[PDB]
Amino acid sequence: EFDAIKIALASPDMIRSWSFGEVKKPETINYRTFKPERDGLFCARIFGPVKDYECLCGKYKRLKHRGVICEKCGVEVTQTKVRRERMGHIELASPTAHIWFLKSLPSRIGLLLDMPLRDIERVLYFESYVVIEGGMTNLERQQILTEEQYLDALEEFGDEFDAKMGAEAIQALLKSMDLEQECEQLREELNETNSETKRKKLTKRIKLLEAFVQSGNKPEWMILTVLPVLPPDLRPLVPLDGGRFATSDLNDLYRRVINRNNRLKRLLDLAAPDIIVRNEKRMLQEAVDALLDNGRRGRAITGSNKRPLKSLADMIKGKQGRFRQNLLGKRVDYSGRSVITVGPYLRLHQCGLPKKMALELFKPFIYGKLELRGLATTIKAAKKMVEREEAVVWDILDEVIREHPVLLNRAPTLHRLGIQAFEPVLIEGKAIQLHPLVCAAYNADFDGDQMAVHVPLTLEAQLEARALMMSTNNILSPANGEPIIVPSQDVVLGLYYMTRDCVNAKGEGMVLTGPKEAERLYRSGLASLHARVKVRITEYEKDANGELVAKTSLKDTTVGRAILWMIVPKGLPYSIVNQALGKKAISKMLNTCYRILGLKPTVIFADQIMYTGFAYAARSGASVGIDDMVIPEKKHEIISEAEAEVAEIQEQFQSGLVTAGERYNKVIDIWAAANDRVSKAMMDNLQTETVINRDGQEEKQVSFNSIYMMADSGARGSAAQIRQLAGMRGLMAKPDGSIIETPITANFREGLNVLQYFISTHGARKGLADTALKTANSGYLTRRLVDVAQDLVVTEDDCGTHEGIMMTPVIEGGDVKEPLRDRVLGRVTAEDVLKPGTADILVPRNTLLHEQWCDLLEENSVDAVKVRSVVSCDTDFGVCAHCYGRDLARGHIINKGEAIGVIAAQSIGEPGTQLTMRSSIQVKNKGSIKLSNVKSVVNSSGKLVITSRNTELKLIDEFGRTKESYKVPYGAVLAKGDGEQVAGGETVANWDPTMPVITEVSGFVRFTDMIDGQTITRQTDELTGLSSLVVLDSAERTAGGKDLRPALKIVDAQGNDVLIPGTDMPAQYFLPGKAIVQLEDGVQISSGDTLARIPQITGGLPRVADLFEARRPKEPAILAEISGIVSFGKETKGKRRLVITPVDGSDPYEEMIPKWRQLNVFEGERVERGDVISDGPEAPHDILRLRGVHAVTRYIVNEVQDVYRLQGVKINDKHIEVIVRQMLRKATIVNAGSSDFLEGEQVEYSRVKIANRELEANGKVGATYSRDLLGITKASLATESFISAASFQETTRVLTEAAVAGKRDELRGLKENVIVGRLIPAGTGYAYHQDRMRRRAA
Amino acid sequence: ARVTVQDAVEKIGNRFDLVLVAARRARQMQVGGKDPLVPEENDKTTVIALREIEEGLINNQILDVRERQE
Amino acid sequence: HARSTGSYSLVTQQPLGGKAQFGGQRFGEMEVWALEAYGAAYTLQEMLTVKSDDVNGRTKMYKNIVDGNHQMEPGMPESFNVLLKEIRSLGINIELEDE
Amino acid sequence: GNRRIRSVGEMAENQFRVGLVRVERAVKERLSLGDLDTLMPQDMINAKPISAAVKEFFGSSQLSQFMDQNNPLSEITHKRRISALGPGGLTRERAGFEVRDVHPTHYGRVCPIETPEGPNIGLINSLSVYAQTNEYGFLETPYRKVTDGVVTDEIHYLSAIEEGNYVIAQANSNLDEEGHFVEDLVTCRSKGESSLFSRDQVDYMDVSTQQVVSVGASLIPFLEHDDANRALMGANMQRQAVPTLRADKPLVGTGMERAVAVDSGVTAVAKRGGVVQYVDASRIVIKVNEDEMYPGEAGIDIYNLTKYTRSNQNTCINQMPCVSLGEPVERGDVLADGPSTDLGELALGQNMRVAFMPWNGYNFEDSILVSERVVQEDRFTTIHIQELACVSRDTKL
Amino acid sequence: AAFRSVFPIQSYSGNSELQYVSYRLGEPVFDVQECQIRGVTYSAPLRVKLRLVIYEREAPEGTVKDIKEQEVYMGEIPLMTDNGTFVINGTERVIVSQLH
DNA sequence: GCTTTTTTGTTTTTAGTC
DNA sequence: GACTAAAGGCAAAAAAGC
Ligand SMILES: [Mg+2]
Ligand SMILES: [Zn+2]
Ligand SMILES: [Zn+2]
Incomplete structure (x- = not known):
């Protein structure tokens, strides 16, 4: 009936328009009778009659005057449902201020006025006065006042002295001032300002008021003057025994406030003096405060036996609140629960049902079936007929059961396959007979686990159950790539016994016409189940476009293999069943079929596998002794x-x-x-x-x-x-x-x-305790994944972007764990795929790499093909179909509409059960040596030694494929070179696990620029046998001596500070603390010779939990976010300063650097843009903010994949990435133009604002924002939709914030649509809304 | 009778507007219904629509176009 | 245990609980996730609106089943309008702005 | 050594003292401000607060659990239960991982096998068969004193802390004829660890091979062959067994069946030896021996056996006279058999004939097949007794 | 010992001392069988002998009157059956040991 | 078993200090 | 100018009353 929700404050005239009358007195019921007062709170003229199609006096008896008013009782003679919806109002003689904006910690009244709330409360409860231009020159409009000051000013000016009182004064001040000049003056103030503490408050205020002026709500409307009254149905008063009533808490406060209003009206009926006016106005003020929110300030209950009453706030939020306990977790009928068992004679789309449960569930359908045939007459007749369980009941029930799928689901529905559908089959017993194979999906053994059966009612529900819910459609697991109908525990051994081969048995060595003969030889007991026969078979191939060509030959095999081959479908090669068919093969078997013949052949083939395996496991016999x-x-x-x-x-x-x-x-x-x-x-x-x-x-x-x-x-x-x-x-x-x-x-x-x-x-x-206590923490994690990724709905097909870099197979030091084949499978390419043959394009751009293009990659030895990712998409609160990739649940590409965030959350949460809680480089393969980050120099031995700590080495195959990877630490010698063909078992690099520091130029070492004894200490130890030079730190050595950062002066034969020729800097290398030098004085040193020697994973579930939360580690590895040459800073009381010297731009940068921990950074390091400084764990924040958005994606996905692979679980990388696209949902504005200066808000909103702005305002800089991340715990709190925020946390605050700001909710999520009862726009509901808007409201 | 929708997926692949149009078909086949275009074997309208996908002249895109016909 | 339609609690119009007193099977929210993960929207709407917590729809649906129909009410349940009234009671202007 | 067991006596004393002081301050005040010589103690003293406090503690607490009657083993292991919960222990939310673990000092004091599974594991562990309480409340276990190389038949009880600085041999270690170990390097354990020690070094030997497991886990045959997890599963499902209408002896047992049957009070045991004079399906009359019955009272013994009665798990209790006419009985001899027992021996289920083989998937993963023969002869059919109570109140109408 | 913990009772200034003397356990009113049948606690009455001694007012510690109230009823104490268990109303409930 | 009260872990704001 | 440590308030949990 709608597609968006707008929330804003209300105006008195429109509030009255909502109302239908005015309530005068609180007499809800009269004595000696049971007729509610015609002019009271429970007013028919205001709300409606308590009788259907009848007035209070009953002169119009439900036949002539339906819907028209009555002369005696002024109420339209109609039904009682209008009484459920009709509402009235109460007019307040003295206007009052709304209390939530007073009681909110971010006080909206205080924020808009720029005064605290303490004085406002005093002037609201009549304890202090407010000046309203009492004097033109003495004070201003925004000052507090007292009685003595008021009297003093009254004698002072008097004529021009005006100062009102209370909420009417507050609203008069609020209305009498404007907001435009305020907005421009605040914009100018923020334009020229220096402080930061008040800067955030000023930005919040200017944002609030600029939204307020745009919201269309006048500020004075916040100070309400007419209060609507809730319809009487929400405050029931049932008549108890002896004329008593339920004592509804709402009616008590309504009576209190209306009594206050009547008393105030009587007080103003004779122009009472202001001495008692203030008292009555104050009492009415706390009355309306208690009704609007009881117990928040004064706890003035006064209406119970020392217990609080539920006025308004108790029925907004709380567990007793109905929101997330009555639309999230609740009872339901049309369901049953019972134990399970194994029905090994059923098909994949069939489940058994006990007769009693079947009749109990389907009795409403039986009556409709019975009355249609005319056997019964009334509902009572049908009920008593089925009560005796006669003959016709069973057959009509079996008729209605035939096409009416039922939904089965275990209690812990961990993932997407928890709820499945089946066609019932009526059987005797009291247990849910279930198919064996499907029990692998439920993860439900038969040790007494219970399942519940539901039943759809409408045609929509049953049709969608048939289309989606049924098990025959949900063959492939949504987790990574594999079917859930893999043959289970017992059948696998039966198939294994089917296909073996002994060296000698009865009936071996002869030949058979075909697989039909092998069945008759074994069944008649003339030949063994497994032998060495030679049989002739005929199969089919899909070489042509849908045409199955037949070929025959004499393939040597065993008897059992022919029996197995009898049941395989048409188009599969015979090579699949020659080997001893284990367990992983059969699954692969099914996979092959799923990629050659479709779905129906695969499911019927799996059913035949189950039947044959069970039969030939029973007939075989396999006991243990x-x-x-x-x-x-x-x-x-x-x-x-x-x-x-x-x-x-x-x-x-x-x-x-x-x-x-x-x-x-x-x-x-x-x-x-x-x-x-x-x-x-x-x-x-x-x-x-x-x-x-x-x-x-x-x-x-x-x-x-x-x-x-x-x-x-x-x-x-x-x-x-x-x-x-x-x-x-x-x-x-x-x-x-x-x-x-x-x-x-x-x-x-x-x-x-x-x-x-x-x-x-x-x-x-x-282990048992860990498993018992793991069912809570792990499952809870899924919740924190569902809320953040609640919507993530695919909306449109293609956006046209072509971003993304370096989708390549991952190498983890040793051998490759997974190749490019499975990493990129299911994704769609964005850039054109270039065959390694100098522009001989193999795979065109914008194509789905399912199998065929994957089949074209292994022969070309391609190792770097980038495909379009979810993070690199630029839509509006959604993902493109041609950007998410191929849907994993079904063979074809992703459809339009179906949710992905919930899929990802469930897929990542399911493996929690299997998730626990608590010097040289060696080559192993054959190929060519390649070095990345090439920075090396020839050493004294003629080999290569690196001076860059971030150098890495990789072994490359003869075809260009990378097969190994090894990080090369600083000061590591090289035993080979780039491009040399070296096989395995030969070390190439060596380093000490102390770290040596090495020079770069040859010559003597004139030990100057240091203080002997102070900086370098003559540690003539007995072990080293020489007066070594130790450069102690500031604390270790003397403070005065360590005040120059000593650097050894490497010199040539001339004895001078020779430089790197003309380019960078002399041979002076600043020796850090504990620079252990074994040289004494003036020893010849060649290029690339050592100078000194510095003497330098939790559980899987906590790792996942704190990785998704993006918690800062114990020591975040600091990084140099600027280029140029790095330098050394000064020394302070704590962590030593470290200044950087970029060769260009804003070079004067420094930071707070600890010195106790290792610092592998030196003066002679030409650092780059985005290179790490320290060592250790790195928080995602810096990685995102300095080295690109894609960098944080490649980090956490690799970490979680490593964790899961360690736990022996494999999942697809689409699920992990999509929440990242939701995790990076905020940004910070750097350059003004859209926000004020620094409003951290939704990045998509800023991007869409800038994109349309550039079209019309060509030239404006807009907003050069920085996309910053947010933990899922923090991301759930920053939801765009206010309904989701109001669902669980601080409902009063978010409601007020949305009301004042005029927030508009487009209902883009799923939990928010579940909250309001509308159809969820993720599944078939999405297609409904799209078709709803096309026809109506086009 | 019919249990799978592989025929619907292979040519008219979509699981959402397909079930929507099937529901629209079945609703007015149930109340105010007329004779179907294919033989019936003790089925209700909750499965007859899917079989009409197999014959070809009834399909998800066909119903959307056929809406103009009605 | 099995239940089709019986009595309901006085405070809230929900079916009873437990095997005794003709109770109903509990429907949590993890399966709400599992069912919205599919394309299922109509079943979710039915089993959160008409099956469990309704009174006008519940009685109507029972009467709409016996007479050979399986047709719902394609509109917003009154359990949502009351919420609207709640928000309209305090001071707030809430409305179905787009229709 | 830092954990102490409180039995019913200590809590009874504590609650009695609480009620005592609660009434005593009030009566002291009343006597101080009231009469001086012309008052009786009986009217000024009070009894209702003490009675209410003690009855509330006895009938409502998180430690006064509800007795389970479905099995003699269930009731014996419930009476032999040790719980770390209740008013004075620790909660389930704040229970650490380390207080849910088996310390190396549980050998012979608390069973490391029998333990409820789920939210509360390691908190409700029961105590072993030979474990007995000390005078101060500590847990004490028997041991056999060895002087130099010979085991002394006299027993010796050791507490926890005293075990720390000793060396204790193992029961499975063989003795030749008078304690001489077969090997001069015998296995042993001294301080939370096991090692090999010399023959002359050892001084204490464990009494038997049974004081490690509790009664609930000492009737699982061949326990030294299956996994600890499966041992716990078996112990629990043995606890939760339901009696049949006609119990049958276990073909393979342990020898503790008689002890568990007779130590528990479900079965009727002859109090004084004698000869039987009249048997009946509901009562037993025993002609006590002449030389045993003390003078003055020359009567004969009467045992009024109980019949079908409602139990806490709705199972049935009915004693069956397992004796005949004119046969002698001894003191402490079994005369009648209650539920799930026969001839003074525990019997929880039935001995079926089973074969281990897959069969058409009807025994797919954990499921079982049953021949229709057993359901013909009613070898497993049980009887349950249910209570229905209807009260007649008085409303206003 | 529980009585001996609060054995002395002494007035404010009235020179009144209440002291314990002896106690005895009464026989249970109903046997266990009828306790299960009827629904009552298989308990025993508590009888105590209390001695109240009074001295002369504003005088040294010299006794005046010794009020010996014998068999004072101090409520009912539930009893353990011979099998080592307690019955409260109709169902046997056993209190297990506590490890603290 | 359903519902309100008091208690403890998590979150947020402000006075004092390097 | 920013870090440190203090309490109020918010929300979840055990307990007790109905
Ligand atoms: Mg089972
Ligand atoms: Zn009228
Ligand atoms: Zn896109």
Whole structure:
């Protein structure tokens, strides 16, 4: 019925227009009868009748005068619903001021007047006077006054002395002054000002008043003079026993204020003296204050047994408030709850239902079905007919069940697949029979977990359930890239047993006509399930445009593989099922099908997989017994050796040769080595147990042991569980973190000592407690992701931008973790893709790289293709379809309208359960050596040594692909060069883990420009055997001596301060503190020779939590945000100053630099724009503000991806990036033109204002803003829509702020639309609104 | 009967205005309804619309154009 | 446990709770997120407006089901208008500016 | 050593003293400002505040829990419960990770296995079988004194702190015939850690292999083979078992079944030895032995067995006479069997014949198959008793 | 000992001293079976013997009258059953030990 | 189990000082 | 001129009354 909400203050005339009458007396009911007073508060003439289509006197009896007024009772004879909506008003003889603007911490009245609130309160409750040009020359309009001053001025001037009182005086002062000259004068004041403390207050005031003048609300309207009255339905008064009533709190205060009004009216009916006028006006003032907001100032309840009453504020906010507890979390009917079980005979779109639950849920539909057929007559007849559960009821229910999907959802709906749809199938029992495969999506085992069933009612709901909700459509997980219908625990082992091959069995070595024959050979018990037959098969290929060409051959395989191949669809190659089909393969299997044949073949193929796997797992038989878990015989012997060496280490401590720590490390290391040896021995024994002869000699092959079948097939378990079952359980650690020195030497099959079990107890208690307490903190995190990314709705198709830099595969020091193939898959390119062949373009720009363009990248060895990102989009409160990328839930590209922020929040929150709470460079591959940030010089040995600390090295493949990356620290020698073809296993750089500092030019070292003894100390130690030179700091050395920043004077044979020739600066290098120099005096030093030697990750869930919050770390790594040559500052009482000397521009910059921590910055460092100064963690704030917006994107996504990969969880990078586009939602104005000077506000609003301004005001500078970030916790508080802000935090403040500022809400979010009850404009609701505006209000 | 919308996705791919026009079709097939264009096998109107997507002459863009026809 | 339509609480027009007294299954808000993450808007509208906290729509919907219809009321529920009246009561001018 | 157990006596004393001082200040004031010689103590003293305070403490508190009657094991492990909650402990929100952990001094005093799961884990751990309280309130455990190399049969009780500066051997360590260890380097534990010590160094030996686990976890057979988490799961679901109409003996047990059955008061035990004279489905008459019954009173024993009665978990209690006519009984002998027991031995469920094999997915992940034969013979059917109460009040009408 | 903690009772200036002498436990009014049947606490009455001694006013500590109130009723004390549990109204409730 | 009261962790403003 | 430390206020939580 609308598409936007505007909120503003109200005018007295329009307030009266809202009203329908004037209330005179508070008598809500008369005695001896039950007729509300015709002229009282509960007035029919003002609100309406209490009877449907009848007047108070009842002369018009619901047949002749519907809707027209009555002569006796002046109320229109109509229904009672008008009484629910009709409202009146109360006229105030003495105008009063609204109290919220007085009681708000940012007092709007105080801000607009530039006086505090203490005096305003005094003059409002009649304790001090207000001057209104009492004297033309003595004082001004904005001064307070007292009684004695008023009398003194009255005798002084008298004729010109005027000074009113109270709220009427306040509103007279407010109206009598303008705001224009104020706005220009404040703009000029901020234009020429120096202070900063009052600068923010002045900017806030000028913004508030310039919004006020634009809002269209007159300030005097804030001082209300007519108060509307709530309709009587909101204040019910039910008649209790004996003429009593519910005692509604609203009616009590209404009676109080109306009594005050009547008493004031009577007081002014005879021109009472001002002595008692003030008292009555004040009493009415606290009366209206209590009604408008009770208990805020005086707590004047006076209407209860010493408990507060709910006047207005209690019913705005609070948990008892209805907003976020009655439209966010609530009861619902048409639902049931029950336990689950496994129905392994159903299809993907079918779920069972008990008969009792089915009839209970669908009884309203039964009556409609029954009455249509005419079997029943009335609703009671139908109810009593179905009550007996007769024959026709079952068949009609089975008829209505056929097409009516029901929604199933577990209680913890963590992610998008929590709620699914199904077609019911009526069965006997009292449990929800569920498909097995879909239970992987719910993460719901069958140990008693309960699920709830809902039911849609309207055609819209059922049709959308069929289109979207049903499981057959939601095949692919929205998280990263993979289906949720991967075959589950039991079926995988069945398929694994389907496809094996022994060396000799009944019926092997012969040939079969086709897969049909193999079924008959096995079923009749003439050949084994797995053999070495040669069968002829015919398949199809999709080489042509939709035409399946057939080919046949004789492919050697096993019997079981043909049985499996029977059920695969048409167009798949046979190479997929030759190998021993494990678990990861089958999933990949489905993936392949999803990318060749579509959806229906894939789902029917998965169903066939489940059926065949279950059938041939049941028919196979796979039991576990003691004889199946074989203990390696060597294991016992092993411990002896370990024991022996352990004793040896003890002797080392017995003679004092070793200390406690190193002995402990040695014993734990040797025990770990023994554990590794025994684990390898047990794996070797298990893997090749089977030795079956084939025509004479014995042959070895893969073992058929049940435990190894479970481990290898991936159905359940892993190497760790199998190692624990037979081998060592492994040495456990004490809960504080210390590892015990005596590992458990016995497995579960063998006996366990009481101490070993007791030691192993608290190892599992810690994990159990962590899992138990993790269900709260992790899930709560999802909330803090949903509110910030609540809307993020895709609105239009394409914006046309082409930004974004360097979307490349990430290398993490060692080998690459994920290639470019999966990183860019699903995204759409922006720049043209250039094949590495000198402008031989392969992939055109603006194309979706799904598989085919990805298939064109591996052969060209492309490693740097940039695609359009979410952050690099310039729309209005949305994202372009051609910028977000391909939707992950469905094969095609993203649709129009569907929400992305909630998808991302749920996808990032789901892996929380699997998320825990608490010197040289070595090459490994073959390729060419390449160095980034090339800054190196030839050393004394002829090799290369770098002088730039930020140098990095990467190994490059012969095709140009980067395969390795290594950070090269300062003072590292190079063992190779750029472009040299070097294979693996050869170090190329070496550095000390002290950091050496090295010169750049050859010659002597004339040790001058330093004070001997003071700066350099002759530390003639016995170890070094020479009088070393140690440059102590200011605190270590004498304060007077350390006052020149000593620098060694490297000289040539001439003995002079030789310079870098004509270019930069002499050989004087400022030695920092503790510059350990082994040279004594005047020793020849070649170029690139050392000068001195400086003696220099929390849990995953906290890491994610404080990364999204953008919390500053313990030590933010300071960075040089300016170019030029860096210098050294002065010394103060604390952290030493450090001045920078840029070669151009505003060079005089310095900062507060700590000295105790390491500072790898020197005088001879030609720093650049955006290079780090210190070392350690870096907050996102500086990264965003200095090195571009894209820099912060590449940082946090890499950090969270590293965390998740460490936790063994992979998610797509679209979800992490989009919230970033929402995280960077603010900016700060640098150059004026749009804001005042520094109004930190929405960056999109400023950008859209500037873009349209430049079209019309060509030449204006506008606003050269800086896009600054904000933590999600802070970002949720700065929502553009005021409804979302008012949802949970400080409802009174935000409502007043929106009212005074005239805020207009366009309803762009989702939570805000849920709050008001309108359809959410994210899913099908978005298409409704777009079609609603097209036809109507076009 | 019909359970999937792969045919709708592969050529008329959109999940929102498609269900909107299907609802508009089904609402006036239920009340004030007339005979459908395809045979019925104990189905309601909550599934007959999707099958009409398969025949081709009824599609998401067709209904929007067909709105002018009505 | 299963419930179609029974009694309602006196203070708020919500179905009862627990297995006893013919209670109704609780509908939180994490599944509100999970359901708005889909394209689902009509189901959300139904199950937050007419199924749970309505009185005029609730009785009408029951009567609109038995007579062979499944048609809702395509308009703003009165649970929103009352809120509007609330904001209109204090001092505030709130209105559906665009229609 | 820094944690002390308060039993019912200490809280009873504290509440009694609180009510005492509360009434005593008032009566002292009244006596001071009232009569002097012509007054009786009875009228000036008061009893209602003390009675109200003690009854409120007994019947309403976060530590006076509700007894569970669904199983004898449930009630024994509930009476053997130690809780860190209540008025004087710590809350769930402010409970740290370190107070939810197993300290190395719990060996023999508090069970490290039996512990409720969820929000409150490590706070409601029960105490072991041999653990007994000290006179000061500390927890004390038995040990066997070893003088030089021989174990003395006499027991010796040790507190927590006193254990710190000692060396204690292990029960599984073998003794040849009189305590001589098979190996002169025997395993041991001295200060929160395990190591290997010489034969002459040890002086104390643990009494048995059972004082580590509680009663709730000492009836799981082959406990030394399964995981600790699964041990806890088994202990909990063994606690929560429901009795059948006809309990059957466990084929594999532990030997503590008789102790748990007879120490608990559910079953009827012969108080004095003798011979049986008349059996009935509701009462038992025992002809007490002549030489045992004291002179003066020459009667015979009567045991009035209880029948179907409502329990806190709505399960049924009914004693069954497991004796016949004319057979001798001894002192402390079992005469009747209550719910979930038979012949004085605990019996919680039934011994089924099971096979481990996947079967058409009907046992897909954790689900189970049941043959229709067992539901024919009603081997698992239970009986439940429900209470319906209707009150007749008086309104105004 | 609980009585002995507040054993002396002494007036302001009236020279009145109230002291404990002895107590005895009364028999339970109803046995456990009818307590479960009827819904009453299986408790015991508390009887105490209190001695009030008075001295001459404004005179040294010389006794005048010894009022010995025997079997003073001080409410009901719930009793533990022989199985080691308490019953409050109709349902047995056991108080577990507390670790502090 | 529903609802109000008092208590403690998180947030915000202002006087004093390097 | 900016950093440090103090209280008021705001919101979430345990407890008690109905
Ligand atoms: Mg289950
Ligand atoms: Zn009339
Ligand atoms: Zn775009």
